[PDB]
Design a protein around this ligand. Structure first.
Ligand SMILES: CCCCCCCCCCCCCCCCC[C@@H](O)O[C@H](CO[C@H](O)CCCCCCCCCCCCCCC)COP(=O)(O)OCC[N+](C)(C)C
Ligand SMILES: CCCCCCCC/C=C\CCCCCCCC(=O)OC[C@H](COP(=O)(O)OCCN)OC(=O)CCCCCCC/C=C\CCCCCCCC
Ligand SMILES: CCCCCCCC/C=C\CCCCCCCC(=O)OC[C@H](COP(=O)(O)OCCN)OC(=O)CCCCCCC/C=C\CCCCCCCC
Ligand SMILES: CCCCCCCC/C=C\CCCCCCCC(=O)O[C@H](COC(=O)CCCCCCC/C=C/CCCCCCCC)COP(=O)(O)OCCN
Lengths: 105, 70, 114, 99, 98, 83, 303, 129, 71, 347
């Protein structure tokens, strides 16, 4: 099966493209660099099984950064409640959210 | 003689003069008498957005001089 | 999983620099020459703390330094700076290379004054 | 937005002017009265497709010239062009460019 | 997972199903394969651009190149099949039976 | 010696385009390894600041790191000006 | 005022194309010891208008068996692409400032062959289909070398932005830096638009004709921008506009001259020309132009 | 929010794939695929992938579908998941793509060998005999 | 200076959104105002929808497509 | 074709397989699969005829669809986790689509339909290469991601492959279709132990490859592609028929022959994981493969079929080309049972 020639010879044929946090050109960071860094450091040498049970917090944070399901759900709930109150008529957005604020540099 | 070709050619020249010149004039009229600001690379766009906010008239072209530093 | 802390609207009040990008580009070289220390402190703190909320004072300091720099320019070298930044503002790319003459006037004026 | 408006304007003007050209002479009344499948033409299209793919590979060259690893990028660009020339030469010597 | 990715995957599934229907015209089989690779390109590009994986910007071009090369091969094969029968109908390839 | 010259002379006739193309390609392969300005181009690429130079925290044990841009220590670009 | 800008770009090109035909006939006639049209109008100036009115008032011969859909669509695509390819060009300032303007023009030129394919296949004739296939093969063949030459030339510009070409040629034209690429580019542009010596092939016919002539003018304008750089002063762009228009007119008149001066190729002869003289030289010069800035430490700035 | 323009673009893309997935009159299927490719290119370009979108629009549309039609002729919600910062004085897409010559040596080698073998394979298959 | 202004503006927008959330969610039973969706206490760069979620459509279009649509 | 071109294409096929086996990046694995696909097509069409062209185009269609599904699985995996390394699949049905793509590449049921057709269309050497070398890369990927697979789906497709191979081999008079159905059944046996032990999968792969090489080389030496064409071999080369019968008995899983070693081990392994019913059913179904092997043995060497007159002339000539590895292949596929514990070498 897998013949790990790269590790035996120290060639680095394709390991540079495997993860987001591995020496991007011009030091451009990935959107989830910190989360992936934390998850990788936590799971290094532990192994996949213990890694799957014990590094669940970091992986959940990484997935939340990647897809942001929880953030969009919370924003949608806030917007839905705001729409409900604005249709009922007990809430009025401030001028800041209406375009009448004083923009800052 | 050959210079009888010059009239039609001249017309072509006039037709080819109109676009470019027009653009320049429009760029002078829409952008407050100056060259239209180009924005590649997303840093010039940030500069334009900052200029738009500072003026208070919601226009990037209006320039706030030192006189606004108190 | 916890409550995110944010500074109050009062903590984010600062005397803002209200000059356009043309003025900033015209003054940028001398600004970096003169305001290096607060700017470097702010950027070092910003890259080490990795948090906007932990570097709020340094932003006020760099704003104050920029305001002082512009105040000195206004007191001593207002006019040549005005022509220089007007020339910079005309160009659509805001190129330095088209009016090296105005830049020379402004540079000699600031060298003589400050 | 501006590009969308420009494309829409160009398409709309072309369509309207084609329609008026096609309908102005239709208002006045008038009388109102194989297999061969040449094989070389297919090879021309296939060769064009392959060379277009290699051009697609060559396209990022203007930005490739600022990497600080100039020797490696020069080697790889020259390698790509050498293999493009080799493809051309192989198809040449195999009587693939004949009529 | 936003709705755009779901729409792209639905488009890919539709292309795959249409490839699996085989009304006629193996050329339509190649068309379905190319629609599938187009959907793959679009969704991979959207995912890579979104997460700012700078070195991953290599991958779509590569994919495109390889897939187009495959298309060329397929087209060649089609011609030879047609070159035997004169038409690219699927049911002409009934010589081999399980 | 003679056979090679004869082959090149026969190719220069009735096939000049191929001779010119092969010569230009060979020169393009060979010349960069011999020019002294390729290192200059590499250095020019190195001196183009695309990112902000993040300052280093001083600990009193970096005599080579300047505290201000006008300090003499640090990389210089006088050679680029001379070019 | 973007609508006004679009209209002021789109109408003068069409007028220029109408008058180009008069110039083409007039230039050719004087090259043949005769005159062009000099009766309809003071100097033939009314000839394009009479031609347009007659062509627009003449019966359209719809094949009575063709697919009306593609039969209508093909001129629409031709005119749309021809008018769209003028948007990226900077004279001195472009209508739309694209980062990858040259690449956009390449993509549009690549699309340009669909009109030929659809016109041939909707013509409902085997012979017209064969002719359309020949034209499409020639077009794709020569656009290969067009793309390679274009990227080789842009290797000295530093980007695909069309405006940067003005900054590159502020002191010297690009023709002096690489004339062989300009020669092959000129021939490839002649072969792309099916112009002599490569011209082997009422209303919709006029549509295709205006599309082809607009493509000719745009190709000459792009060549003038790419290889004959005009000096631009930011405070008076009219000088740059005048210089650019003069160079474009000179290049178009050069196309007319070449049409008037030569016989025509065979199909296999132009195929051999391209695939066995231009492609090897193009690849060799592409290698040379890749390696040259690195040898000389003259790499363009933008990245 | 322009009524979620990306949503309409995706729906038109799906509609086009459904349209030629019935495979009617393979030139009409190819034209539906041309429209679908244009819509997908518009999606990528509107997202911000200018270079990759132009690669689609050039390579895919102008070469591959053109050769497909040529051979056939021979025969008979949003805006939320985006970023906050800027990119610098360049485009990250262009830098990542141009890294192919400095970072992706292995990719260049394998792709070039594959393309050369593709040319050889095409010649051998189309030899005939 | 641009970095300082960016940080201040982002924080001020987040503060406004937090105030509006506190006002709006006063009747929702189980809501906790300003609760993080991450287990970590590290600062996380907010999304574009976190800053412009409650604002008007025109400036959402600006912040999302202005650079892409500027030609 | 030109021998240089053939050598280059064979080396390209092997290089694609090696690129799949040595790379840790999903894109490089897909590129290796693409390279192997591209270089395999002319090999199937070395002898130009409509049958070979039909087989090649069917194979190309199936493999291209499999590659597209593989890329979609890779992209979904990247979407749900920004990882390119070949590791645990990190996601739901993205793994299902990966398994389906690899099953279509291998020829497992229900994607078995193309194997008999492609094998019948192509010649015997192309069939040898197709049935031996084209299994290494997908099986290597499956062994790498074995801890990710859902056991239900993998075991279902393995049992289906065994059943379909057993039933479809009974109806064949062509030898190439018999070999194709044998390959399907053997792959079914191979993939039913992947969820439990990949070493057993590799051992089964080695034994099957040895037996298939011996069988195909014996079929090439006595150039017959039909049961009756093979029935004429005894009148010229009885020793070839005897070796063929012994090899067929070995492929049937009879002890003490070598082909008994994998199934035995596999059954043993599956009993360690508290699984009994599936090993029982697999043995009872492999009985069908044994039946049609035994029918071929009856028609080959245990009985003497009528011959023809012109056969006498064939008595006066000897094979100019001789296969060097054929003797070794027969011995390894017949007499290696006592060396069974050597499987600890993690073959
Ligand atoms: C050791 C094995 C040799 C025999 C076996 C050959 C196996 C197949 C042949 C392909 C293997 C060739 C080795 C190339 C591996 C790529 C990695 C290595 O070369 O290092 C590169 C060095 O690049 C070298 O220039 C590679 C040049 C060799 C390639 C040119 C010709 C290749 C042809 C090989 C066969 C292709 C088809 C047949 C053609 C005849 C990386 O550059 P580097 O700067 O350190 O790091 C970049 C990352 N940074 C930016 C962070 C610093
Ligand atoms: C480069 C510059 C390009 C400028 C753009 C082009 C501008 C176009 C200008 C259009 C000019 C007007 C054209 C009108 C002529 C129409 C043709 C014509 O003469 O038809 C005569 C035809 C004869 O038919 P019958 O006698 O009944 O049957 C006999 C056959 N059995 O009579 C008609 O149909 C008349 C048509 C109505 C015209 C009335 C108005 C005049 C035309 C104005 C144009 C209208 C659209 C604009
Ligand atoms: C056909 C034309 C399609 C290409 C249009 C846009 C091409 C382009 O490069 O402009 C992109 C432009 C700016 O990008 P940059 O040049 O990189 O610089 C701006 C950043 N400061 O931004 C945009 O993309 C805006 C417009 C994108 C949406 C629409 C694009 C075209 C989509 C068409 C869909 C319909 C196609 C129907 C079938 C087509 C068959 C021919
Ligand atoms: C590794 C170097 C690569 C870099 C340079 C090359 C880049 C691009 C050039 C190569 C492109 C592909 C060329 C394909 C060659 C095919 C040759 C061929 O087979 O054609 C022969 C002809 O080819 C030959 O003549 C054989 C070789 C001729 C010479 C080739 C160059 C060898 C070295 C010459 C230059 C050496 C270095 C330059 C020094 C010169 C002094 C300055 C037959 O011609 P027909 O068209 O079929 O004629 C039939 C109708 N009458």
């Amino acid at each position: 099966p897998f013949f790990d020639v790269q590790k035996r010879l120290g060639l680095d044929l394709d390991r540079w493209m495997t993860i987001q946090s591995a020496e991007q050109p011009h030091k451009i960071p990935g959107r989830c660099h910190a989360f992936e860094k934390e998850w990788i450091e936590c799971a290094h040498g532990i192994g996949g099984i213990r890694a799957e049970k014990e590094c669940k917090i970091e992986f959940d944070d990484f997935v939340e950064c990647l897809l942001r399901q929880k953030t969009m759900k919370r924003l949608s709930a806030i917007k839905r409640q705001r729409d409900k109150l604005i249709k009922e008529g007990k809430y009025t957005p401030p001028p800041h959210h209406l375009g009448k604020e004083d923009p800052r540099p | 003689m050959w210079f009888e070709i010059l009239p039609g050619i001249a017309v072509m020249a006039a037709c080819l003069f109109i676009p470019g010149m027009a653009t320049a004039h429009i760029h002078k009229f829409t952008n407050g008498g100056k060259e239209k600001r180009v924005a590649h690379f997303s840093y010039q766009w940030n500069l334009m957005e900052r200029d738009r906010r500072i003026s208070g008239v919601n226009r990037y072209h209006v320039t706030k001089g030192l006189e606004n530093i108190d | 999983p916890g409550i995110v802390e944010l500074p109050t609207l009062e903590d984010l009040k600062v005397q803002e620099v209200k000059v356009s990008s043309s003025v900033l580009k015209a003054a940028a070289h001398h600004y970096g020459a003169q305001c290096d220390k607060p700017n470097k402190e702010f950027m070092l703190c910003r890259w080490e703390e990795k948090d906007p909320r932990r570097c709020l004072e340094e932003g006020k300091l760099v704003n104050q330094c920029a305001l002082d720099f512009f105040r000195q320019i206004k007191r001593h070298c207002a006019e040549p700076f005005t022509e220089y930044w007007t020339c910079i503002d005309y160009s659509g790319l805001q190129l330095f290379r088209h009016c090296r003459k105005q830049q020379a006037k402004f540079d000699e004026c600031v060298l003589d004054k400050l | 937005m501006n590009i969308m408006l420009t494309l829409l304007t160009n398409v709309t003007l072309a369509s309207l002017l084609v329609l008026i050209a096609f309908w102005l002479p239709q208002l006045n009344a008038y009388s109102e009265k194989r297999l061969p499948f040449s094989m070389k033409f297919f090879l021309v299209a296939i060769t064009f497709l392959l060379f277009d793919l290699e051009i697609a590979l060559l396209l990022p060259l203007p930005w490739a010239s600022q990497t600080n690893n100039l020797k490696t990028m020069l080697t790889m660009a020259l390698f790509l062009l050498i293999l493009l020339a080799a493809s051309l030469a192989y198809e040449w010597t195999q009587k693939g460019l004949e009529w | 997972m936003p709705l755009v990715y779901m729409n792209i995957i639905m488009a890919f599934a539709i292309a795959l199903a249409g490839l699996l229907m085989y009304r006629s015209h193996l050329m339509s089989s190649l068309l379905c394969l190319e629609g599938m690779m187009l959907s793959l390109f679009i969704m991979s590009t959207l995912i890579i651009l979104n997460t700012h994986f700078t070195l991953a910007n290599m991958m779509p071009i590569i994919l495109l190149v390889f897939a187009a090369c495959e298309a060329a091969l397929g087209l060649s094969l089609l011609v030879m099949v047609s070159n035997t029968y004169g038409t690219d109908y699927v049911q002409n390839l009934n010589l081999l039976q399980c | 010696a003679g056979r090679i010259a004869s082959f090149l002379k026969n190719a220069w006739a009735k096939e000049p385009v191929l001779v010119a193309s092969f010569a230009i390609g060979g020169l393009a392969i060979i010349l960069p390894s011999l020019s002294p300005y390729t290192n200059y181009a590499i250095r020019i690429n190195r001196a183009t600041p695309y990112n902000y130079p993040v300052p280093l925290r001083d600990d009193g044990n970096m005599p080579d790191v300047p505290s201000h841009p006008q300090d003499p220590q640090g990389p210089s670009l006088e050679w680029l000006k001379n070019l | 005022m973007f609508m006004i800008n679009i209209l002021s770009l789109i109408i003068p090109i069409l007028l220029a194309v109408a008058f180009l035909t008069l110039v083409e006939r007039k230039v050719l006639g004087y090259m043949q010891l005769r005159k062009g049209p000099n009766v309809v109008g003071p100097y033939g100036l009314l000839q394009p208008i009479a031609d347009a009115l007659k062509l627009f008032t003449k019966e359209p011969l719809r094949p009575a068996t063709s697919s009306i859909s593609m039969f209508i669509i093909a001129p629409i695509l031709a005119l749309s692409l021809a008018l769209t390819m003028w948007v990226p060009l900077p004279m001195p300032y472009p209508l739309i400032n694209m980062n990858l303007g040259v690449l956009f023009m390449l993509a549009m030129s690549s699309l340009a062959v669909y009109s030929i394919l659809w016109s041939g296949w909707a013509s409902n004739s085997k012979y017209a289909l064969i002719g359309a296939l020949r034209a499409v093969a020639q077009t794709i063949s020569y656009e290969v070398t067009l793309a390679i030459i274009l990227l080789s030339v842009l290797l000295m510009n530093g980007s695909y932005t069309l405006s940067t070409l003005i900054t590159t040629q502020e002191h010297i034209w690009m023709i002096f830096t690489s004339w062989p690429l300009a020669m092959m580019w000129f021939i490839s542009t002649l072969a792309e638009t099916n112009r002599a010596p490569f011209d082997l092939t009422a209303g919709p016919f006029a549509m295709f004709f205006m599309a082809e002539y607009a493509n000719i003018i745009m190709m000459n304008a792009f060549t003038a921008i790419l290889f004959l750089g005009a000096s631009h002063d930011p405070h008076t762009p009219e000088l740059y506009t005048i210089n650019f228009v003069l160079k474009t007119l000179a290049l178009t008149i050069t196309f007319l001259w070449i049409r008037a001066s030569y016989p025509r190729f065979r199909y296999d002869q132009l195929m051999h020309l391209l695939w066995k003289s231009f492609l090897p030289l193009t690849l060799a010069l592409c290698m040379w132009h890749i390696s040259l800035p690195i040898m000389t430490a003259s790499i363009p700035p933008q990245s | 929010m322009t009524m979620y323009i990306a949503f309409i673009l995706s729906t038109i893309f799906v509609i086009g794939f459904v349209g030629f997935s019935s495979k009617p009159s393979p030139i009409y299927g190819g034209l539906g695929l041309i429209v679908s490719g244009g819509v997908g290119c518009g999606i990528v370009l509107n997202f911000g992938g200018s270079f990759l979108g132009l690669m689609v629009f050039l390579i895919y549309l102008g070469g591959m579908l053109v050769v497909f039609g040529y051979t056939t002729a021979m025969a008979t919600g949003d805006w939320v998941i985006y970023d906050t910062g800027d990119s610098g004085f360049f485009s990250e897409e262009a830098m990542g793509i141009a890294a192919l010559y400095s970072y992706g040596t292995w990719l260049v080698i394998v792709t070039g060998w594959s393309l050369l073998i593709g040319v050889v394979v095409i010649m051998e298959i189309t030899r005939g005999n | 200076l641009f970095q300082a202004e960016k940080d201040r503006r982002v924080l001020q927008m987040l503060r406004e959104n937090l105030e509006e959330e506190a006002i709006i969610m006063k009747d929702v039973p189980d809501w906790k105002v300003g609760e993080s969706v991450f287990h970590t206490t590290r600062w996380v760069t907010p999304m574009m929808g976190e800053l412009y979620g409650l604002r008007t459509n025109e400036e959402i279009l600006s912040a999302t497509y202005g650079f892409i649509w500027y030609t | 074709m030109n021998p240089i071109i053939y050598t280059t294409l064979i080396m390209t096929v092997m290089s694609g397989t090696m690129l799949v086996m040595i790379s840790s990046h999903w894109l490089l694995i897909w590129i290796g699969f693409e390279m192997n696909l591209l270089a395999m097509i002319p090999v199937l069409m070395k002898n130009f005829n409509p049958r070979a062209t039909e087989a090649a185009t069917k194979y190309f269609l199936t493999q291209a669809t499999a590659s597209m599904m593989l890329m979609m699985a890779i992209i979904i995996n990247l979407l749900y986790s920004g990882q390119w390394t070949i590791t645990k699949m990190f996601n739901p049905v993205a793994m299902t689509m990966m398994t389906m793509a690899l099953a279509m590449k291998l020829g497992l049921s229900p994607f078995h339909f193309w194997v008999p057709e492609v094998t019948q269309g192509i010649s015997l050497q192309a069939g040898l290469l197709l049935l031996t070398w084209q299994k290494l890369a997908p099986l290597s990927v499956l062994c790498q991601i074995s801890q990710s697979i859902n056991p239900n789906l993998m075991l279902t497709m393995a049992m289906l492959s065994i059943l379909i191979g057993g039933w479809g081999g009974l109806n064949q008079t062509q030898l190439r279709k018999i070999m194709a159905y044998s390959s399907i059944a053997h792959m079914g046996w191979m993939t039913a132990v992947l969820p439990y032990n990949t070493t057993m999968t590799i051992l089964n792969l080695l034994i099957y490859i040895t037996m298939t090489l011996a069988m195909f080389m014996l079929l090439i030496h006595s150039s017959a592609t039909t049961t009756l064409s093979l029935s004429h071999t005894w009148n010229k080369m009885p020793v070839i028929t005897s070796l063929m019968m012994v090899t067929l008995l070995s492929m049937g899983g009879l002890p003490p022959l070598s082909g008994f070693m994998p199934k035995w081990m596999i059954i043993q392994e599956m009993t360690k994981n508290e699984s009994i019913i599936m090993p029982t059913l697999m043995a009872m179904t492999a009985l069908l493969n044994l039946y049609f092997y035994m029918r071929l043995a009856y028609s080959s060497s245990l009985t003497m079929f009528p011959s023809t007159n012109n056969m006498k002339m064939k008595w006066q000539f000897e094979h100019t080309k001789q296969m060097k590895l054929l003797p070794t292949m027969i011995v390894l596929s017949t007499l290696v049972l006592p060396m069974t514990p050597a499987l600890s070498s993690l073959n």
